[PDB]
Design a protein around this ligand. Structure first.
Ligand code: NDP
Ligand code: NDP
Length: 1211
């Protein structure tokens, strides 16, 4: 019968290693698992064991991938046709695997002999270790677990290595496949789809296994790309074909990205850039003036009702707090900054937050969402009101945020359950507090010592406040009255966020009795203050506050050090508070110590207190704008930001602007009209993998557009054929692929000729050899290639049979080509055309078939061939799927042509075809197609216009309108993309590290050709050597430098080496050393040697770039999120990061380039992952960000004006 295999990935299941075979986050059944189950079925059928049965698989095809569920079981049916020697593997009656399988009757041990390498005796002592091998594999999308990690050693090119034999036939062969795909230059996931022949002989496999010193038997694997053969032990795979597997967007982590910027404690004029708020305020003022003498919002409606005319106000009170003006600061960064300040001055991660009068406050829908990005914050929010029913309408909302409920009138003392709160939030803009003094006392008592009060209110004497008072005529209080009341209840104002229309967020703190503070200056360059800090923090009984001071050395990293010390066991409540004076300009005078400013700071007792350009405040995180930045550029292309989404189509800045290597053999042509082809939308809808297109293409560039029309460098009207990137504002092509647009033609019409007519001429004339008077069968005759072939054939006086799928297409073809008769047309949507042809050729058939159809239509087209018939395959589905073609049509002297006009871009002879097309232009044989023109801004519409298939002729995106002034005589808003000129040298300090190598690869893919990688010890690992070798082989001038940036002379020398290659355009500080440990373990030398790679190194890089790099474009430093928020155990790391950030802010303030990226945990590569953080484990509440996401985030960050940006992934 049929063998049933119940694949269960359970712990006690005998097949549990399969959970370790993870590809793009989904547990996929290995392609070798099917081979193993078929082998078991065959062994059962022939009565032998698996280890006693040498086997041969042939023409194995994998039709679909089986996803193993987390829980449950997948049933696989294996059916053997022994007489046919074939097998079949099905999931639920759906074909999964097909091929042939049979016993190896005469096993050949000589088949399992390692072929000689094409480049032998490499003399390379460096090989890829198992950790490096699987780091590289995981970078490509292969999350293989420990069971599927059998490659314990590999050569730098992947042609040879060692495979660990764990008595598993699935894992061993899967590691063979990993070895085959390791040396592949292709990028991304590549899953096996077809394997020509697998020969497995366990008899020689046992004898070819040798045990190492670890007593673990291994085999030697050799991959010959020349022979296309992988041999390991007794396994020999030949003809393995791997097809690209798109990476699922579900596995794509969504990272939270913030900007880390300075904000003063007192802010005024907030929300001024909001035009809607200004318009609403103007309308309210006009309504108030009319009463004394957008518009659909609650406040304008109430004002209009009052103008028309108590009852109305009572009815509209519930919707009053939701007004945009009354909630402007509630939906503003000021509230987020105040919340961050509150959670910053906290004993531990616990956050006890209580809201007063939540019925009209509506702070339950913003505060927990705003504090959600905090990774380790434990939030306890309680919504309280005098009347519980007022919260009923918000009940469901209170269920969404897990907010507790309670009853408490502000005029009465708080309940004991609500006492000792950490944060108290009120929104009394609409709600009435009653007696301000009694209430203020009530939640002064309710708040614990050191707690924070955040109240959003309206100020009397202001437009919004005056309007509210007039409408309502306890009540609206002025700022002076509010401050006096705060002083009455012993509240110290630490924050002030005032809008333009008067609404204000007051932040107050309850003072805590503290002894005389100890002032510790942490500005010493020798880092001798760390010993004093350890000594003062060595005691636990004393709780006297310790104020860190950084009056000198404005580029001090005290912020990161303090943030890291807060969550340490020593100093959580010992008040490790800082005082930094970071003046971004020398014009602003500094704040003298021992004066009233320090007294005010102590009175506020805010943990983060920085003086910047006259302002007193702190560095806070803010949510980054979700919109991708756009710039006006003359060079842009069309890209699908998310694969398969036609709505994601956008104009992205191209690499043709920053780098313009105008040299003979290439030409920068301005694109006026670019046509869309079938391949473009097979790319844009995800049906065709971008890597399937031949050519050296990176994983970032878009391949939309194979042809274009427009102007040239000299301004002549030209049209062109390109392998890719033709859908752009400008295109770089050789003149070998250029034709001159004739005067009678329009640039719009000419943008339809290149691809279709070149393909028709190559298939018909070059390969088909269409002699005049012959009989042709042209499929999709209404298409582009079809119309071109019809025109050529009618020029040659040929009988033509065009297959079209519509009556309108028939009519258009008849009108366009009057030489075609009613018998010239058949149906392309069914096999029927075959009979039609076989009827009108007298059963002889057609001489030439221009076939773009597939499957049964392809077979019918083959059956239409006459004797000496030429079959020109223009389509690719049956070619790509390796569909069998019956080799009996060749008995009719038939020649089968696989016509692909894509080898002309990576090989020649193309000129012949070129000449033909030019001839067709001269004779009038080449006639422009019908063009459906879409504007450049509507490109996506065009992409979804002909994908429906109703288009006739060609669809053309009008990138630029043709000027009628002459035939010989462009800024657009495009998404900013980071591209680097080839004439600039880019330095990556620490570029040989984990993040360094991947950043170098990303920069190289972005156009960097002169690269300088700085390492303290040069190349040591096989992975580093392999990456450097690949970069050098592909043309990048990567240079490994031992020069250390920690010394000024070392930085100068490094910049000199970079300038030797070319002008310095980018400096990337990724150097880092780890001296992590608790503060009592910390030593001054540890801080010195940690800050030297990062702080002193960045200072030296700053100085040298200022003095010797006038053309610098990128000055990027990679800090950690430990500085932004805090991580216990690494205080020196945080100090170095914060100092780097201050350096970058100083650089950016003066106009020079500067960027500090506060990375969270990095997943694919790094240092913490390689040592002991396998896969992506929750580290400090932040998940390890994947490298692809890291590179996209860096690309986004590099095109922003913000000095310091942070990115991490929530757990
Ligand atoms: N191998 C090579 O060198 C090259 C091959 N080509 C191939 O030529 C074939 C056709 O290309 P081309 O003629 O320019 O494409 P067109 O957009 O001009 O039209 C293709 C024809 O295919 C039919 N068709 C079937 N399904 C669709 C659909 N979903 N959308 C639009 N049309 C559809 C239509 O004819 P009807 O609907 O009446 O059946 C249409 O007229 C493609 O398979 C393409 O891969 C193109 C260039 C080079
Ligand atoms: N991966 C992560 O978890 C996180 C990383 N980052 C940032 O990522 C960047 C890269 O670190 P990462 O790739 O992760 O870890 P790595 O250990 O792999 O990279 C550190 C590299 O920097 C080298 N280096 C050390 N000192 C110097 C120096 N003075 N000059 C030049 N090179 C030096 C290191 O020493 P050597 O030459 O001996 O090899 C090592 O090569 C750092 O900025 C780091 O702060 C930020 C947050 C998290």
């Amino acid at each position: 019968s049929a063998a049933i295999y119940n694949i269960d990935t359970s712990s006690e299941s005998p097949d549990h290693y399969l959970v370790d075979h993870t590809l793009d986050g989904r547990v996929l059944f290995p392609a070798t698992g099917y081979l193993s189950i078929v082998w078991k079925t065959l062994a059962r059928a022939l009565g032998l064991g698996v280890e006693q049965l040498p086997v041969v698989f042939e023409d194995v095809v994998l039709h679909q991938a089986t996803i193993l569920p987390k829980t449950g079981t997948v049933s696989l049916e294996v059916r053997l046709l022994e007489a046919s020697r074939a097998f079949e593997v099905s999931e639920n009656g759906n074909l999964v695997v097909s091929g042939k399988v049979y016993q190896w009757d005469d096993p050949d041990p000589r088949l399992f002999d390692h072929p000689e390498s094409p480049t032998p005796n490499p003399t390379e002592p460096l090989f890829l270790a198992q950790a490096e091998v699987y780091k590289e594999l995981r970078l490509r999308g292969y999350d293989y677990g420990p069971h599927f990690q059998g490659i314990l050693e590999a050569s730098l090119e992947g042609d040879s290595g060692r495979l660990l034999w764990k008595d598993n036939w699935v894992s061993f062969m899967d590691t063979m496949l990993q070895m085959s795909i390791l040396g592949s230059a292709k990028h991304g996931l590549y899953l096996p789809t077809r394997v020509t022949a697998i020969h497995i002989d366990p008899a020689t496999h046992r004898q070819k296994l040798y045990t190492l010193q670890d007593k673990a038997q291994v085999a030697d694997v050799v991959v010959s790309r020349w022979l296309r053969v992988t041999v390991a032990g007794g396994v020999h795979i030949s003809g393995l074909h791997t097809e690209s597997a798109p990476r699922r967007q579900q596995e794509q982590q969504v990272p939270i990205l913030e900007k880390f910027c300075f904000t003063p404690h007192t802010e005024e004029g907030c929300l001024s850039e909001r035009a809607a708020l200004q318009e609403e305020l103007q309308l309210c003022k006009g309504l108030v003036q009319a009463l004394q003498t957008p518009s659909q919002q609650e406040l304008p409606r109430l004002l209009s009702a009052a103008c028309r005319l108590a009852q109305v106000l009572a009815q509209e009170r519930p919707k009053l707090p939701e007004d945009p003006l009354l909630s402007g600061l509630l939906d503003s960064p000021a509230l987020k900054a105040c919340l961050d300040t509150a959670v910053e001055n906290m004993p531990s991660l616990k956050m006890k937050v209580v809201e007063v009068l939540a019925g009209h406050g509506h702070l339950y829908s913003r505060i927990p969402g705003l504090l959600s990005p905090h990774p380790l914050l434990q939030l306890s929010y309680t919504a309280t009101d005098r009347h519980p029913q007022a919260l009923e309408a918000a009940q469901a909302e209170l269920q969404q945020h897990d907010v507790a409920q309670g009853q408490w009138d502000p005029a009465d003392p708080a309940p004991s359950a609500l006492g000792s709160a950490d944060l108290l939030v009120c929104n009394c803009a609409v709600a009435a507090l009653g007696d301000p003094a009694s209430a203020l006392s009530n939640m002064v008592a309710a708040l614990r010592e050191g707690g924070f009060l955040l109240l959003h209110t309206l100020l009397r004497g202001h437009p919004l406040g005056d309007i509210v008072a007039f409408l309502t005529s306890q009540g609206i209080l002025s700022q002076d009255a509010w401050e006096s009341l705060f002083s009455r209840v012993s509240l110290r104002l630490v924050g002030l966020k005032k809008s333009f229309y008067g609404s204000t967020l007051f932040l107050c703190r309850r003072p805590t009795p503290q002894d005389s503070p100890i002032f510790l200056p942490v500005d010493d360059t020798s880092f001798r203050w760390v010993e004093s800090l350890k000594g003062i923090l060595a005691d636990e009984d004393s709780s006297r506050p310790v104020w860190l001071k950084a009056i000198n050395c404005a580029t001090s990293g005290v912020v990161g050090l303090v943030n890291c010390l807060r969550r340490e066991p020593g100093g959580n409540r010992l008040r490790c508070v800082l005082l930094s004076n970071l003046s971004s300009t020398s014009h602003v005078p500094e704040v003298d110590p021992g004066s009233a400013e320090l007294q005010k700071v102590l009175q506020g007792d805010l943990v983060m207190n920085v003086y910047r350009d006259g302002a007193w405040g702190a560095f806070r995180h803010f949510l980054l704008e979700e919109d991708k930045p756009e710039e006006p550029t003359a060079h842009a292309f069309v890209s699908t930001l998310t694969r398969g989404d036609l709505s994601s189509i956008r104009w992205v800045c191209s690499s043709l602007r920053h780098a313009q290597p105008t040299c003979p053999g290439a030409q920068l042509c301005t694109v006026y009209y670019a046509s869309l082809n079938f391949r473009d939308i097979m790319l844009a809808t995800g049906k065709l993998s971008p890597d399937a297109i031949p050519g050296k293409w990176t994983s970032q560039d878009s391949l939309l557009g194979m042809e274009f029309s427009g102007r040239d460098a000299s301004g002549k009207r030209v049209m062109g054929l390109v392998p890719a990137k033709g859908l752009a504002t400008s295109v770089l092509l050789s003149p070998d692929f250029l034709w001159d647009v004739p005067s009678n033609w329009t640039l719009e019409e000419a943008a339809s000729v290149p691809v279709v007519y070149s393909t028709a001429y190559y298939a018909l004339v070059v390969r088909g050899r269409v002699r005049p008077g012959e009989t042709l069968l042209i499929h999709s005759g209404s298409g582009g290639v079809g119309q071109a072939a019809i025109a050529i054939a009618l020029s040659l006086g040929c009988r033509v049979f065009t297959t079209v799928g519509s009556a309108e297409k028939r009519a258009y073809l008849q009108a366009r080509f009057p030489q075609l008769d009613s018998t010239s047309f058949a149906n392309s949507r069914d096999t029927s055309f075959e009979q039609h042809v076989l009827w009108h050729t007298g059963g002889k058939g057609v001489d030439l078939v221009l076939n773009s159809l597939a499957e049964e239509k392809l077979q019918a087209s083959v059956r239409c061939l006459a004797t000496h018939g030429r079959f020109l395959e223009i389509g690719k589905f049956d070619l790509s799927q390796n569909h069998p073609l019956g080799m009996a049509i060749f008995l009719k002297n038939v020649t089968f042509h696989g016509v692909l006009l894509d080898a002309f871009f990576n090989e020649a002879d193309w000129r012949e075809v070129w000449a033909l097309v030019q001839a067709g232009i001269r004779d009038g044989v080449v006639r422009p197609l019908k063009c459906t023109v879409f504007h450049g801004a509507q490109v996506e519409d065009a992409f979804r216009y002909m994908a429906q298939g109703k288009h006739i002729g060609k669809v053309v995106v009008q990138v630029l309108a043709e000027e009628p002034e002459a035939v010989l005589k462009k800024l657009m808003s495009a998404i900013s993309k980071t591209f680097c000129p080839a004439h600039k040298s880019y330095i990556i300090a620490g570029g040989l590290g984990g993040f360094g190598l991947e950043l170098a690869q990303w920069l190289i893919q972005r156009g960097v050709q002169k690269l300088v990688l700085t390492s303290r010890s040069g190349i040591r690992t096989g992975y580093q050597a392999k990456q450097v070798r690949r970069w050098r082989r592909q043309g990048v001038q990567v240079q490994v430098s031992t020069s250390n940036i920690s010394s000024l002379e070392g930085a100068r020398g490094l910049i000199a080496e970079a300038a030797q290659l070319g002008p310095v355009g980018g400096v990337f500080n990724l150097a880092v050393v780890l001296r992590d440990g608790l503060l009592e373990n910390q030593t001054p030398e540890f801080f010195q040697d940690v800050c030297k790679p990062k702080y002193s190194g960045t200072l030296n890089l700053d100085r040298v770039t200022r003095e010797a790099c006038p053309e610098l474009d990128y000055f990027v430093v990679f800090s950690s999120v430990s500085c932004g928020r805090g991580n216990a155990g690494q205080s020196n790391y945080g100090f170095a990061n914060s100092a780097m950030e201050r350096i970058c802010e100083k650089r950016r303030h003066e106009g020079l380039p500067g960027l500090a990226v506060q990375w969270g945990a990095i997943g694919d590569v790094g240092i913490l992952v390689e040592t002991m953080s396998t896969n992506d484990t929750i580290v400090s509440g932040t998940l390890p960000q994947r490298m692809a996401s890291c590179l996209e985030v860096l690309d986004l960050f590099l095109n922003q004006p913000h000095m310091v940006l942070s990115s991490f992934v929530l757990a």
